[PDB]
Amino acid sequence: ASATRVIQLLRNWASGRDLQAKLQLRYQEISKRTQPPPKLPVGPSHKLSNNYYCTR
Amino acid sequence: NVETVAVSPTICRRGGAWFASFGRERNSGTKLFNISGHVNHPCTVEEEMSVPLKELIEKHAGGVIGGWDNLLAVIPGGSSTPLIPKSVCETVLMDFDALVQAQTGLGTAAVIVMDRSTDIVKAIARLIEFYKHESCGQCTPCREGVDWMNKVMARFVKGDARPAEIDSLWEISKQIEGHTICALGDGAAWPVQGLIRHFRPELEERMQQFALQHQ
Ligand SMILES: Cc1cc2nc3c(=O)[nH]c(=O)nc-3n(C[C@H](O)[C@H](O)[C@H](O)COP(=O)(O)O)c2cc1C
Numbered sequence: 206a207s208a209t210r211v212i213q214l215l216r217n218w219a220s221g222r223d224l225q226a227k228l229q230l231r232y233q234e235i236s237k238r239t240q241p242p243p244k245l246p247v248g249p250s251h252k253l254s255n256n257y258y259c260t261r
Numbered sequence: 262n263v264e265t266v267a268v269s270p271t272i273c274r275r276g277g278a279w280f281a282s283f284g285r286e287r288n289s290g291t292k293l294f295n296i297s298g299h300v301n302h303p304c305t306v307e308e309e310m311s312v313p314l315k316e317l318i319e320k321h322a323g324g325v326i327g328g329w330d331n332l333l334a335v336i337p338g339g340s341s342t343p344l345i346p347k348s349v350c351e352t353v354l355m356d357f358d359a360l361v362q363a364q365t366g367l368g369t370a371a372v373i374v375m376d377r378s379t380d381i382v383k384a385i386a387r388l389i390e391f392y393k394h395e396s397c398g399q400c401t402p403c404r405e406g407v408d409w410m411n412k413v414m415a416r417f418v419k420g421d422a423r424p425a426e427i428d429s430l431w432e433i434s435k436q437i438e439g440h441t442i443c444a445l446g447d448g449a450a451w452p453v454q455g456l457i458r459h460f461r462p463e464l465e466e467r468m469q470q471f472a473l474q475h476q
Pocket residue numbers: 262263265443444445448
């Protein structure tokens with residue numbers, strides 16, 4: 206946050222906690238909106254043998 | 262059969278007990294053996310029923326090419342029957358019951374031998390391709406599954422496949438065998454079963470070499 210030192214000290218005193226530690230507005234700490242592709246593993250029934258549907 | 266009909270009159274003229282003397286019990290009589298493949302002297306000869314396979318090849322066929330140590334595999338009863346390795350064909354007789362005990366069956370007693378200087382997977386693939394070319398296509402198991410097996414088999418020679426496929430191929434045969442109209446489905450499933458059961462490590466090795474070469 207672009208809050209001056211005096212305003213920060215005043216707001217932390219009025220509230221009673223350290224506010225800059227836990228801010229309400231989201232900043233660069235969040236993840237990117239463009240991500241690598243996934244691979245998404247397949248389930249247990251994707252076998253080639255010993256996989257008859259009458260057993261599952 | 263032609264052989265059965267042709268031998269019936271001699272059985273009548275000489276007696277049934279004389280013909281029953283040869284061979285073991287429930288395996289009586291003489292048999293025509295067509296020994297072909299990697300033998301010095303491929304030949305058709307008549308012999309008593311329960312001859313040891315090695316004795317028959319050593320006497321009548323002139324010995325396997327390259328000596329007995331060169332032997333790799335033998336298909337005793339024609340393309341339909343499963344193949345057997347050198348370990349069990351050392352002391353195996355040639356009749357119905359004993360060959361069934363070898364998981365093969367006597368079949369037509371048409372012996373095809375292959376030494377160790379040949380691609381066994383290629384031979385089994387050719388057999389499967391023949392069976393694909395010879396099925397009438399009436400019922401869906403034989404038709405579709407035998408074509409399907411042939412495609413899988415062709416890749417196996419190349420090794421273009423994976424280790425998981427080998428198990429899958431086995432189940433495919435379980436779906437062909439016993440579910441068709443006639444026994445051509447059984448005769449097409451059994452060679453694959455025998456080749457897998459007795460040379461799975463060879464298929465694994467070929468697959469590994471293909472995976473290494475193609476990265
Ligand atoms: C796909 C297939 C092909 C066959 N081809 C022949 C054949 O070419 N010649 C033959 O004698 N039997 C052949 N048979 C087996 C016949 O059923 C057999 O001739 C018939 O059952 C009578 O045999 P038998 O004289 O030994 O009792 C074939 C069987 C199958 C399933």
